[PDB]
RNA sequence: GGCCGCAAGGUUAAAACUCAAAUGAAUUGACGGGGGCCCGCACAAGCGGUGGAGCAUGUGGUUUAAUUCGAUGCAACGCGAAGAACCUUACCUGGUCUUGACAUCCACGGAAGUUUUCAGAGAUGAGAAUGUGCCUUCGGGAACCGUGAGACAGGUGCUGCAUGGCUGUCGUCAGCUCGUGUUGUGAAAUGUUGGGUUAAGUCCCGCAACGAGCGCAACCCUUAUCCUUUGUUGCCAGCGGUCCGGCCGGGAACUCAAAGGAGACUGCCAGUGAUAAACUGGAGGAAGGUGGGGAUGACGUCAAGUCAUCAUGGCCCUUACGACCAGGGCUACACACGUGCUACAAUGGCGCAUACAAAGAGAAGCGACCUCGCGAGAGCAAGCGGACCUCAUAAAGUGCGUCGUAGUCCGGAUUGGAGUCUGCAACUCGACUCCAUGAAGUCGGAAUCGCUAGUAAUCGUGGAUCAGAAUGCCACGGUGAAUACGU
C-alpha cells in the first residue's frame, strides 16, 4: 500500500461467489416455453441444463 | 514508462499472432520422432529464420493504465496501486475488505 | 497517522457498488478496461453538466449507464440530439448494445463531489480559499446536514512554503460504520501547482 | 507479573499407574513435542529400577526425589550498588520441580548407551546418596549457610 | 597622585577603547545523577536461538568499458524486486535515421497473402499473384500502406528544501480542543483539578462553572452451542438384494453444505462499600464478567520516504540528454556487517509395512488407466469450466531387524564423467537425474534476540509472480510443553 520501499502494511481482500442448483423432473413444452421467455437481474448468472 | 517501450509491446504481440501456425508446424516436426534426420535438420535451420519477437515468451505483462513492469495481477489487468485506487473508489465488482 | 477511505470501509455495510455484474476470469479485465474508456470519455464531455456519479450495469449483452447530474437539461437536450450521439459513441466503444438513462440531483449543496468541485472552479479564478470554505460549509449546514468538514492543502495564495487547513461544522463520526458519511475528492491546477481539496458530509445513523 | 492473578492448570494423571507426579516428570524430560518418546523412555526406566531395589516403582521413585528436595536457597538484592545472597525458604512445589529437574539434567550428561539406561543409574545413584544432584543439593545448602548474617 | 599601616593591604577615585543591549517579577512548556501514584515479555521465574562451520540472499568497499537507479540509528540492509539467460533494461562497446518508434493537421498515389538475394541485425534491392467494400448526381477515400514541409512530437534529464496523491513512526498510548460565563493591567487560568473506581478523560460523588466536539466503548468479519427450511455431485440407523463396495432398491434420521432465528446483560444469590459507582465469591449454562482472534490509527512530531507507478510549477536537450539493432554488464572478489537454511548424532542413521488432516488451483489449463526407461522423463490417450474429474501418496507416529560411541553405516561443500526438459537460443549465467569423489563441524569469546496457551518448539501441505527458474513472502492443519513468589 505504499509507492515505494515499506514491507509490511498490506492489504486483504476478498471475493466471494454464491451458487444455488434447482432440479425439474417432469416437464412439458409449455414450461420449457415459459423459462426460456424469463428475464431476470443484470448480476445473475444462469446455467440450463438438459 | 516511456511511450516507446508500449509500442515495442504492441508490435510484439502483432508478429505473436501472425506467424502463429508456422511456428507450431516446424515445432511439431522437430519434436516428432521417427523422421527422416534431415527434416529435422531443415526444420531446425528454419524455425531460426523468422523474426525473433514472434515468440510469445518475449513479451511483458504490463498495467493497462500506467505500464508499470512489476507487481502484475492477471485477474485485473492492473499493477497493487491502481487495483487499490479502484477498489476504494467502488469499481470492481464484489472486492472489499477481509478480516477472519 | 493515515486515515481508512470512508466509501471503501463502509462497502457491503451501508454503502452500495458503482458497477454491478458477473463475469469469469476470461472477461473480468477487459470488461474492466472498457469501463475505465466509457467513463473518461463521458466525464471529459459533459464537464459542465454537473456530474456527479456514473453507474454502469452489464445484463445478457449489452451496457446500460445511468448518469446522476444536477442540470438534466444541458444532457437531453433539444428532443435528445445530444443523448443520442452519446448513445452511439458509448455503443462504439463497448462494443455491445448500449442504453443511457438521466437521474437528477434535487440538492446539489448536500453533495460531495459537486461541493468538491464547486472549491476547485472558485480557486482557479483568484478567489479567496478561506471565502471559499466558509461558504461551503454554511450551504451544507443551513439546507439541513448534520455535519461537514472540509479540507485543503498546497501552496495558498501563492505561498513559497505549502500548507494544509481544514473547517468543521457539526457531528461527524468516521468510526462508526452504520453511519451514512459521504466522501469525495477534486485537485486545483494553478500558475504555482496543484492544490487539493476534500470533503465529508454526514446525513444519519441507519 | 504486575497486576494479575494466575490459575492453575489441570494435569492429566498417567495411564499406567495413576500419579501426577510422574506425569509432571514425563513434561520436564519430553523435547520437540513427542510424548511418546519420552513415556518409552521413563516406563522402561522404571521397570530396569524396580528389580535394582525389589521394590515399587513409586517407593524407588519417592526415595529417590527425597535425597534431592533442597529446602533453602539464595536470592541475589542489589540495592547500595552491591550484590548480596540473600537466604530464603523453598515452597513444596518449588522443591518438587528443583529436584526433577535436576535429575534429568544430571542424566543426560553421563556417558552410558541408552538414555533409559542413563536415567535408571542416575535414580539407583541418588537412592545411594551419590551423584551430580546429591552434590548440587549440597552446594546450594553450602551457599545459603555461609550467608546467613544477611536473612 | 595624596593620606594611613611593621607588613598584608585599606580609603579617596578617572580616561582611551568596545557592544546594542545588560537587568527585575511573573506565564506556558521541556528537562533533573528532585518527590509521590500507576502501566507494558521492561525486569525477575523459564524454554529455544543468533555471535564459531559450510551454503542462500541483501548492503559497504575495491575492481571493471559498464559493474543502471533508489532506501541509511530505533523507523535502511530476503527493502521498491509478487521472480535480470535474449526480452524485462533505464548501463557499456560498435552499426544506423531525422516531422521522427508514439499523435492532430495539409496534398501527391495506392492496400495483405509467398519467395529470392547482400547484411550480426537494423535496413537495402529483384520478383510473382490480387483489384475490396461504396450516393459514384463521378466530388466518397471514411478503413490503411507509402513521401514532402512545418506548427509540433519525445525525455526513467535536475530540484521530495516549490507540490497533489499515497506510506512509516511515537502509539491502540488515552489523550487533544472549543462556545458562553467568571478571575487577572497582561501573557494566561478555570472547566480537564479533588475523594473513590475501571482496560479506558470508564463511571459516581464533590466543586465558579454550565454545555459540546474529535478520540475510548458499541453497530462490522470470523470462531465455540442449539432449531427450522432444502437434500445433489454430499450423508447411511432402521428395512432388503449380494459378485463385499453406499455397490443396488430405497430413507430424510445423523455428519455436512448455507439462508432466517435464539443466546451472555453484573441478568440472579450472599458478603464489603459513602443509604453510591464498583469489588470478591457462588448457582445454572457450550460459553462469565472485553469468552478467543481480526478490521478499525485523534490534534500533531521527524523541511522523515517517494519528480523512477502516476500527476504537476520552474529550469534544461532538440541531425540529440530523443529512435532501432547484435554482442556484453547488473551474477566481478584481498576484505567488513544484517537476515536465513542444513548440521555437528543414539529422544538417532539405514531397510522392510501400516493409522490419522486442513485449506487451495485448473482451457495456449490440470493430465488419470496402460506400455517403455535404474531414474529425471517419453508414447498413446479418458475426465473436467468442477461438493462429480485432475493436481494428490501427508509427514512426524506405530511394529519388526541392524548399526554400537567411531570424524562413524553421523554430515553432504566441492569436483570428474554421462543425461532429461522449458525455450529461436542454456559459454559467460537455468532447474532436475544417474555413477563416482566425500571438505569444514564433536554445541560455538566479549555481546545479543523471540515467546504467557492450542503460545514456544518440532512435522508435513497450498497459492501469487511465472515459458523455465524459492532455503524468500502470503496462507493451512498434526503432535504439544516449562514458568510467573514479586516490582
Given at each position: 500500500i505504499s509507492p515505494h520501499?515499506?514491507?509490511?502494511?498490506?492489504?486483504?481482500?476478498?471475493?466471494?461467489?454464491?451458487?444455488?442448483?434447482?432440479?425439474?423432473?417432469?416437464?412439458?413444452?409449455?414450461?420449457?416455453?415459459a423459462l426460456m421467455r424469463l428475464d431476470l437481474a443484470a448480476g445473475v448468472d444462469v446455467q440450463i441444463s438438459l | 514508462a516511456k511511450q516507446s517501450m508500449k509500442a515495442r509491446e504492441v508490435k510484439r504481440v502483432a508478429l505473436a499472432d501472425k506467424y502463429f501456425a508456422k511456428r507450431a508446424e516446424l515445432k511439431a516436426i522437430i519434436s516428432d520422432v521417427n523422421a527422416s534426420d534431415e527434416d529435422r535438420w531443415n526444420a531446425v535451420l528454419k524455425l531460426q529464420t523468422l523474426p525473433?519477437?514472434?515468440?510469445?515468451?518475449?513479451?511483458?505483462?504490463?498495467?493497462?493504465?500506467?505500464?508499470?513492469?512489476?507487481?502484475?495481477?492477471?485477474?485485473?489487468?492492473?499493477?497493487?496501486?491502481?487495483?487499490?485506487?479502484?477498489?476504494?473508489?467502488?469499481?470492481?465488482?464484489?472486492?472489499?475488505?477481509?478480516?477472519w | 497517522g493515515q486515515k481508512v477511505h470512508p466509501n471503501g470501509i463502509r462497502l457491503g455495510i451501508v454503502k452500495p457498488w458503482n458497477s454491478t455484474w458477473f463475469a469469469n476470469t476470461k472477461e473480468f479485465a477487459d470488461n474492466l478496461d472498457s469501463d475505465f474508456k466509457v467513463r473518461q470519455y463521458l466525464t471529459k464531455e459533459l464537464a459542465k453538466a454537473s456530474v456527479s456519479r456514473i453507474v454502469i450495469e452489464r445484463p445478457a449483452k449489452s451496457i446500460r449507464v445511468t448518469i446522476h447530474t444536477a442540470r438534466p437539461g444541458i444532457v437531453i437536450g433539444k428532443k435528445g440530439e445530444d443523448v443520442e450521439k452519446l448513445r452511439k459513441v458509448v455503443a462504439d466503444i463497448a462494443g455491445v448494445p448500449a442504453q443511457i438513462n438521466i437521474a437528477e440531483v434535487r440538492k446539489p449543496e448536500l453533495d460531495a463531489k459537486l461541493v468538491a468541485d464547486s472549491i476547485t472552479s472558485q480557486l482557479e479564478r483568484r478567489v479567496?480559499?478561506?471565502?471559499?470554505?466558509?461558504?461551503?460549509?454554511?450551504?451544507?449546514?443551513?439546507?439541513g446536514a448534520k455535519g461537514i468538514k472540509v479540507e485543503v492543502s498546497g501552496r495558498l495564495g501563492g505561498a513559497?512554503?505549502?500548507?494544509?487547513?481544514?473547517?468543521?461544522?457539526?457531528?461527524?463520526?468516521?468510526?462508526?460504520?452504520?453511519?451514512?458519511?459521504?466522501?469525495?475528492?477534486?485537485?486545483?491546477?494553478?500558475?504555482?501547482?496543484?492544490?487539493?481539496?476534500?470533503?465529508?458530509i454526514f446525513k444519519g445513523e441507519i | 507479573p504486575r497486576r494479575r492473578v494466575i490459575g492453575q492448570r489441570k494435569i492429566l494423571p498417567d495411564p499406567k499407574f495413576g500419579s501426577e507426579l510422574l506425569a509432571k516428570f514425563v513434561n520436564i524430560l519430553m523435547v520437540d513435542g513427542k510424548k511418546s518418546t519420552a513415556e518409552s523412555i521413563?516406563?522402561?526406566?522404571?521397570?530396569?529400577?524396580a528389580q535394582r531395589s525389589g521394590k515399587s516403582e513409586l517407593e524407588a521413585f519417592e526415595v529417590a526425589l527425597e535425597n534431592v528436595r533442597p529446602t533453602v536457597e539464595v536470592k541475589s538484592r542489589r540495592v547500595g550498588g552491591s550484590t548480596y545472597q540473600v537466604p530464603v525458604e523453598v515452597r513444596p512445589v518449588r522443591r518438587n520441580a528443583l529436584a526433577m529437574r535436576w535429575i534429568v539434567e544430571a542424566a543426560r550428561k553421563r556417558g552410558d548407551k541408552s538414555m533409559a539406561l542413563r536415567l535408571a543409574n542416575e535414580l539407583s545413584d541418588a537412592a545411594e546418596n551419590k551423584g551430580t544432584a546429591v552434590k548440587k543439593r549440597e552446594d546450594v545448602h553450602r551457599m545459603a549457610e555461609a550467608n546467613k548474617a544477611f536473612a
Open positions: 520501499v515499506n514491507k509490511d502494511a498490506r492489504d486483504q481482500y476478498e471475493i466471494r461467489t454464491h451458487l444455488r442448483l434447482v432440479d425439474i423432473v417432469e416437464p412439458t413444452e409449455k414450461t420449457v416455453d | 525473433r519477437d514472434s515468440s510469445p515468451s518475449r513479451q511483458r505483462n504490463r498495467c493497462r493504465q500506467t505500464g508499470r513492469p512489476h507487481g502484475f495481477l492477471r485477474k485485473f489487468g492492473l499493477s497493487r496501486i491502481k487495483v487499490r485506487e479502484a477498489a476504494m473508489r467502488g469499481e470492481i465488482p464484489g472486492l472489499k475488505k477481509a478480516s | 479567496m480559499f478561506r471565502r471559499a470554505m466558509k461558504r461551503a460549509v454554511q450551504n451544507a449546514m443551513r439546507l513559497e512554503i505549502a500548507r494544509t487547513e481544514w473547517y468543521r461544522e457539526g457531528r461527524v463520526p468516521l468510526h462508526t460504520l452504520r453511519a451514512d458519511i459521504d466522501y469525495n475528492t477534486s485537485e486545483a491546477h494553478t500558475t504555482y501547482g496543484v492544490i487539493g481539496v476534500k470533503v465529508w | 521413563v516406563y522402561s526406566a522404571l521397570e530396569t529400577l
